Structure 1
């Protein structure tokens, strides 16, 4: 029951896909692969078809391909991007070389929509609510997004939102250098590798996003890692003795101690005119000590979301086994694992 594939030269490369996918139009390409928008005749949906580039060129890339596939296959939630289809023109493992991932084509991201723009409080409540709803689900599976930012949040005409572009491969040092949005939303503990981070880094990101939706401005637009740290400490105050101890690196800890101490600012005087409940939530999310930040599940129960919160309609995820992350395998082994995941894929209802 293998579909019939047809070939077409797109993105300077040959694309071989099932007949169901029509009107392929290149819309982007990265170091990870090329993407084409298409019309899926089987579902009637507009979709993004991503052809990975040399998915098995090294152990690192092979494991990354496997990682991304396992992750997309697991995500089954309204506010998270899921996998509509995955296919390969290969008819056997020996012939297996290419991987195509198919997902919902999302109109645009939060970035290309609210850029230099301030949204109403009701609008912010709905958007942040959906992000936290997707995040409760994600974290419940012990998965950390690690790269939440406006450009990784898709929204349709009805303001329905989906989280995407999970952190699969560590960004390059150059990618996080300077006045770049790629770093403005990162929690300080991970921006400067202070300690073994956890799911709480994602809540810091939500806080930065939320503040930007409310003000129309980037909360911490640092020109470099240090400038950014100063912008952050200026708002939330410098680390106390309790947090200092939790910082593994002696170097980091030592640099921190060189800074003049500063008290946490009054957020009501920072986010002027903002809903007091919004201010309160921001203070709970933008906490320097990650151990003390509010969790997604806790945040959903915060009064700011009274209008949308429904404890019976904020599902958690099935257990997600990521023991493979510690597996030491050869390229071909990662490739065979990916192959099994491709052929065992079951279309969503």
Structure 2
């Protein structure tokens, strides 16, 4: 039942796509990759079409291609980007050299909702609720985002939010957890919870919480708010050199957040305290945060679903370039679209 394709020049390359997709036009000025908006003649809705770059040039390109298709095929949740379609003009494995991914077309990213102005407390509740609902789902599959920031979060006009990643699945360091920038090495899923705390502060105040000029300055701004490590945290660091280094960027106590977020909802301030903890073993989880009193008007414990298990064992394998290309071809052929 193979569709009829048509060719055109877009982004100075030949795009070849099913006649299903009409009125292609480049969007994002390069910020999303090679992406066009299009009209889906099957549904009457607009979609985003991404063309992958040199997908089987090398073992590293081939494994990156496979990884992104496996992640997108897994994600089935309202608050996470999903795969509407995946296609290739190739009629066989022999001629397989191009991959196209189709998602929802979003309206605006969170920088374009905030625009350096405060949001209302009710609007902040609704946005952060949806990010946490998405993160409960991703974390339940043992997937960590690792680069959450306003540019990777997007809404429609009804303010319905989805999580995406415009980088390489694993630019600015303003949203990065302190353990990552201190090279502490034993990361857990609450690196994403740190990023959510920074984003929530920014929605409430209209300003960046930790706008560091450089790597050193980023850590000094963090430690001025959250303080020098306590005795319980220092006991979990191996190297004398690492313990000296963190203490040399601090020598200062944790501030009370009630003194920093003047005018804010006291439940907002309590939740920010539980997200922005230096010791990642003591940081609140996505599931715990959804039950916090700050989200009473939105929380439904019966509609905060978890993921099917995600087999990540390919990440440990060393395969030949034609093997990664064949595994990718099989995943295109096996795709089942979501319901109309």
TM-score normalised to the size of structure 2? 0.96
Residues 145 and 167 of structure 1 are in contact (CA less than 8 Å); yes or no, is this contact kept in structure 2?
no
Aligned alpha-carbon RMSD (Å): 1.6
Question: 1:211 maps to what in 2?
Answer: 201
Residues 186 and 201 of structure 1 are in contact (CA less than 8 Å); yes or no, is this contact kept in structure 2?
yes
How much does 1:253 deviate?
3.3
Paired with 1:65 and 1:235, the residues of 2 have a C-alpha distance of 40
Residues 8 and 260 (structure 1), Cα distance of their counterparts in 2 relative to 1, 3 Å cut: closer
Residues 14 and 250 (structure 1), Cα distance of their counterparts in 2 relative to 1, 3 Å cut: farther
Residues 109 and 150 of structure 1 are in contact (CA less than 8 Å); yes or no, is this contact kept in structure 2?
yes
- The residue matched to 1:162 in structure 2 has which SS? strand
Residues 233 and 35 (structure 1), Cα distance of their counterparts in 2 relative to 1, 3 Å cut: same
Paired with 1:250 and 1:61, the residues of 2 have a C-alpha distance of 40
1:304 partnered with 2:294:
yes
Residues 227 and 141 (structure 1), Cα distance of their counterparts in 2 relative to 1, 3 Å cut: same
Paired residues, what number? 339
Residues 245 and 167 (structure 1), Cα distance of their counterparts in 2 relative to 1, 3 Å cut: farther
Residues 249 and 196 (structure 1), Cα distance of their counterparts in 2 relative to 1, 3 Å cut: farther
Residues 77 and 137 of structure 2 are in contact (CA less than 8 Å); yes or no, is this contact kept in structure 1?
yes
- The residue matched to 2:277 in structure 1 has which SS? coil
How much does 1:261 deviate?
1.9
How much does 1:196 deviate?
2.0
How much does 1:45 deviate?
1.7
How much does 1:193 deviate?
2.1
Residues 78 and 250 (structure 1), Cα distance of their counterparts in 2 relative to 1, 3 Å cut: farther
What's the CA shift string for 1:151-174, capped at 9, x where partnerless?
Answer: 11011111110111176345xxxx
Residues 84 and 104 of structure 1 are in contact (CA less than 8 Å); yes or no, is this contact kept in structure 2?
yes
Residues 147 and 166 of structure 1 are in contact (CA less than 8 Å); yes or no, is this contact kept in structure 2?
no
Residues 213 and 33 (structure 1), Cα distance of their counterparts in 2 relative to 1, 3 Å cut: closer
How much does 1:115 deviate?
2.2
How much does 1:60 deviate?
1.5
Paired with 2:90 and 2:14, the residues of 1 have a C-alpha distance of 14
Q: Which deviates further from its counterpart, 38-47 or 8-17?
A: 38-47
Residues 32 and 52 of structure 1 are in contact (CA less than 8 Å); yes or no, is this contact kept in structure 2?
no
How much does 1:130 deviate?
0.3
How much does 1:79 deviate?
0.5
Paired with 2:314 and 2:185, the residues of 1 have a C-alpha distance of 23
Residues 118 and 10 (structure 1), Cα distance of their counterparts in 2 relative to 1, 3 Å cut: same
How much does 1:62 deviate?
1.2
Paired with 1:311 and 1:105, the residues of 2 have a C-alpha distance of 29
Paired with 2:185 and 2:191, the residues of 1 have a C-alpha distance of 11
Residues 336 and 211 (structure 1), Cα distance of their counterparts in 2 relative to 1, 3 Å cut: same
- The residue matched to 2:310 in structure 1 has which SS? coil
Paired with 1:87 and 1:340, the residues of 2 have a C-alpha distance of 12
Q: Which deviates further from its counterpart, 274-283 or 252-261?
A: 252-261
TM-score normalised to the size of structure 1? 0.93
Paired with 1:107 and 1:78, the residues of 2 have a C-alpha distance of 15
Residues 271 and 279 of structure 1 are in contact (CA less than 8 Å); yes or no, is this contact kept in structure 2?
yes
Residues 52 and 98 of structure 2 are in contact (CA less than 8 Å); yes or no, is this contact kept in structure 1?
yes
Residues 56 and 259 (structure 1), Cα distance of their counterparts in 2 relative to 1, 3 Å cut: same
Question: 2:229 maps to what in 1?
Answer: 239
How much does 1:195 deviate?
1.8
Residues 219 and 249 of structure 2 are in contact (CA less than 8 Å); yes or no, is this contact kept in structure 1?
no
Residues 310 and 275 (structure 1), Cα distance of their counterparts in 2 relative to 1, 3 Å cut: same
Residues 81 and 162 of structure 1 are in contact (CA less than 8 Å); yes or no, is this contact kept in structure 2?
yes
Residues 145 and 166 of structure 1 are in contact (CA less than 8 Å); yes or no, is this contact kept in structure 2?
no
For structure 1, list consecutive stretches of 5 or more residues without a partner in the other structure: 171-180
Residues 253 and 97 (structure 1), Cα distance of their counterparts in 2 relative to 1, 3 Å cut: farther
How much does 1:254 deviate?
3.3
Paired with 1:188 and 1:18, the residues of 2 have a C-alpha distance of 46
